[PDB]
Design a protein around this ligand. Structure first.
Ligand SMILES: Nc1ncnc2c1ncn2[C@@H]1O[C@@H]2COP(=O)(O)O[C@H]2[C@H]1O
Length: 142
């Protein structure tokens, strides 16, 4: 364990998780366990966060900044948004390539932590499937 002046990273993650209500649906011991499982990591512009084809084994949540999807008809993502749950939702490969348009701070969640947190809250699992369906399709498939 490096850098331990006064759990500054853990404190920042607390406030970071506070920016996400999805994590608020988790109990106290769950949210605390999810916080100790999740880590805040910033991706520099041009840094690929997700690559189509690659298997998703972690989640991503934008805290500050915007992101751009790698495709012919991508979209602009902002803070308070989550992505890369479709894989952790089912296991399918990156539905599309994700690339941070600029330096944005996001949090990382373990696949095991995702299934454990989803097990804690059945609503969070439904919210994920809703986004997975929307992200996966919900327009074409239909
Ligand atoms: N149209 C879209 N808008 C926002 N996010 C998307 C869109 N399409 C795909 N994604 C995200 O790209 C991610 C690729 O990894 P996942 O499939 O696990 O989860 C996918 C979605 O969260």
């Amino acid at each position: 364990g490096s850098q331990e002046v006064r759990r500054g990273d853990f404190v920042r993650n607390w406030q970071l998780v506070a920016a996400v209500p999805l994590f608020q649906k988790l109990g106290p011991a769950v949210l605390v366990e999810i916080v100790r499982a999740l880590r805040a990591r910033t991706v520099p512009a041009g840094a690929v966060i997700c690559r189509i084809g690659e298997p998703g084994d972690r989640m991503f949540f934008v805290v500050e900044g915007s992101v751009s999807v790698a495709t012919p008809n991508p979209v602009e993502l902002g803070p308070g948004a989550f992505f890369g749950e479709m894989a952790l939702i089912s296991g399918e490969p990156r539905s599309a390539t994700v690339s941070a348009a600029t330096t944005v701070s996001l949090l990382s969640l373990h696949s095991a932590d995702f299934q454990m947190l989803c097990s804690s809250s059945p609503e969070i699992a439904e919210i994920f499937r809703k986004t997975a369906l929307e992200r996966r399709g919900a327009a074409a498939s239909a």
